[PDB]
């Protein structure tokens, strides 16, 4: 298992424009197009991202290219963040993948806001962090995914993902 497979499990793969769990237009492997209510606004951002007149449908290859760009971006956002970086750097390989997952889902900003959980993961207090992570809207809104991620930080293994 690795980050790509991990997020591909969590996000799924859709070739047409769709609405994510928050009602925003997305496509591909969880690639957010716009928070805007306009389907046209979405179609515009999509063509612009893809570089052609897509008409709201893309190919597998195009989805995987946006996915590679997205993952890359997430890592670089973590690296550039004064709050995230030190946490990232203190983690082992499995747990780093759980941090990228959250950054991919909610932005570096959203994540940098879990101050206490960050501190805890940094101190390697697994169980405490896991409890603090669950007290959040994130967990209440997407409990199945949040649980897999939280298990990942708690255990340091991919158990939550084997079976899926």
Curated annotation (Swiss-Prot):
Query: One Gene Ontology cellular component annotation?
Result: host cell cytoplasm
State a single Pfam family of this protein.
Phage_lysozyme
Localization of this protein: Host cytoplasm
EC number(s) stated in the UniProt entry for this protein? 3.2.1.17
Q: What molecular function does GO assign, one term?
A: lysozyme activity
Using the record for this protein, list the coiled-coil segments as residue ranges, or answer none: none
Residues the record marks as active site: 11, 20
Q: What is the effect of changing residue 30 to A?
A: Almost complete loss of enzymatic activity
A GO biological process held by the record: peptidoglycan catabolic process
What keywords does the record list, in alphabetical order?
Antimicrobial, Bacteriolytic enzyme, Cytolysis, Glycosidase, Host cell lysis by virus, Host cytoplasm, Hydrolase, Viral release from host cell
Induction conditions: Expressed late in the viral replication.
Q: How does activity depend on pH?
A: Optimum pH is 7.3.
Q: What is the effect of changing residue 117 to F?
A: 10-fold decrease in enzymatic activity
Instruction: Specify where it is mainly localized.
Output: host cell
Is Zinc one of the keywords?
Answer: no
Changing residue 11 to A/F/H/M/N has the effect of: Complete loss of enzymatic activity
The main enzyme category here is hydrolase
Residues reported in the UniProt entry to bind substrate: 32, 104, 117, 132
Catalytic activity annotation = Hydrolysis of (1->4)-beta-linkages between N-acetylmuramic acid and N-acetyl-D-glucosamine residues in a peptidoglycan and between N-acetyl-D-glucosamine residues in chitodextrins
Function summary: Endolysin with lysozyme activity that degrades host peptidoglycans and participates with the holin and spanin proteins in the sequential events which lead to the programmed host cell lysis releasing the mature viral particles. Once the holin has permeabilized the host cell membrane, the endolysin can reach the periplasm and break down the peptidoglycan layer.
Q: Which family does it belong to?
A: Belongs to the glycosyl hydrolase 24 family.
Can you say what this protein is called? Endolysin
What is the protein's species of origin? Enterobacteria phage T4 (Bacteriophage T4)
């Amino acid at each position: 298992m690795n980050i790509f497979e991990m997020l591909r499990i969590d996000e799924g793969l859709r070739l047409k424009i769709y609405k994510c769990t928050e009602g925003y237009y997305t496509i591909g492997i969880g690639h957010l197009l716009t928070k805007s209510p306009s389907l046209n606004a979405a179609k515009s951002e999509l063509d612009k991202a893809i570089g052609r007149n897509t008409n709201g449908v893309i190919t597998k290859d195009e989805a995987e290219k946006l996915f590679n760009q997205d993952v890359d971006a997430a890592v670089r956002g973590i690296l550039r963040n004064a709050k995230l970086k030190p946490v990232y750097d203190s983690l082992d390989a499995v747990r780093r993948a759980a941090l990228i997952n959250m950054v991919f889902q909610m932005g570096e900003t959203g994540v940098a806001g879990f101050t206490n959980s960050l501190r805890m993961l940094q101190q390697k207090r697994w169980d405490e962090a896991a409890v603090n992570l669950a007290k959040s809207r994130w967990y209440n809104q997407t409990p199945n995914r949040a649980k897999r991620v939280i298990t990942t930080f708690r255990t340091g293994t991919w158990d939550a993902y084997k079976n899926l």
